[PDB]
Design a protein around this ligand. Structure first.
Ligand SMILES: CC1=CC(=O)CC(C)(C)[C@@]1(O)/C=C/C(C)=C\C(=O)O
Length: 192
C-alpha cells in the first residue's frame, strides 16, 4: 500500500503510515495539488529535528534562501509558538523575490513541523507544508536511519499546469531535504 513514486520500501512505509495518515493528508480542490516527499538521513532523530524545528533560520538547510528575518515577538520571549510570522528572501531570477510565511505546527514531542505562506511575491499561493522527523529503530544493532517526510498542498495558477507547479515544488523540497541530509550527516559524523 506504498504510494507510487515515494522512495520508501514496504517495510519502511508500514511503520511510517500512522505518521503519514496523521500529519500528511490534504483536501485537494480543483485548483490545487498536493505531494509527499521522503528523505532518508543517517543521523540521530534529534539532530535532524533540531535543524528543522528552527523557524527563525530556514536559510540554513533551505537551498534557494539567501536571507531571512523573523517578525518581532507578540508576547512570547523564549519559545517559538505557532502563529509567528517570518519574511523570507529568495535568490534573484526565480519566480519569487520574497515570501511571508507563518508558523502553523511546532511539536517537539511528536517531532512535527508546519507552516503556511500568506503573501509576498510568488506564483504559488496558499502553500501549506508539514514536515515530520521519524526514527526507524532496528531490534538488532544496525546503523541509524531517520526518515523525514515533507508534504504540501498548493494552488495551481491559471496559466501554469499541475505538473509544472508540482515538479517545481518537489524540486525545491528535495533540494532542501538533500541539504538537511548533507548537513545532519556531517554533524553526526564529527560528534561521536
Ligand atoms: C524557493 C522558493 C521559490 C518560489 O518561487 C516560491 C517560494 C518563495 C515559496 C519558495 O521559497 C518555495 C519554497 C518551497 C516549495 C518549500 C519550503 O521552503 O518549505
Amino acid at each position: 500500500e506504498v504510494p507510487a513514486g515515494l522512495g520508501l520500501t514496504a517495510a519502511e512505509y508500514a511503520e511510517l503510515q500512522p505518521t503519514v495518515e496523521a500529519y500528511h493528508r490534504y483536501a485537494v480542490g480543483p485548483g490545487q495539488c498536493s505531494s509527499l516527499v521522503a528523505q532518508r538521513i543517517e543521523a540521530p532523530a534529534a539532530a535532524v529535528w533540531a535543524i528543522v524545528r528552527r523557524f527563525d533560520c530556514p536559510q540554513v538547510y533551505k537551498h534557494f534562501i539567501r536571507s531571512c528575518a523573523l517578525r518581532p515577538d507578540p508576547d512570547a520571549g523564549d519559545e517559538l509558538r505557532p502563529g509567528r510570522l517570518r519574511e523570507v528572501s529568495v535568490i534573484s531570477g526565480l519566480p519569487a523575490s520574497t515570501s511571508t510565511e507563518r508558523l502553523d505546527l511546532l511539536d517537539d514531542a511528536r517531532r512535527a513541523f508546519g507552516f503556511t505562506i500568506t503573501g509576498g511575491e510568488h506564483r504559488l499561493a496558499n502553500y501549506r507544508s508539514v514536515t515530520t522527523v521519524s526514527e526507524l529503530a532496528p531490534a538488532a544493532p544496525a546503523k541509524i536511519c531517520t526518515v523525514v517526510l515533507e508534504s504540501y498542498v498548493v494552488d495551481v495558477p491559471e496559466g501554469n499546469s499541475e505538473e509544472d507547479t508540482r515538479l517545481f515544488a518537489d524540486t525545491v523540497v528535495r533540494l532542501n531535504l538533500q541539504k538537511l541530509k548533507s548537513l545532519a550527516e556531517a554533524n553526526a559524523t564529527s560528534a561521536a
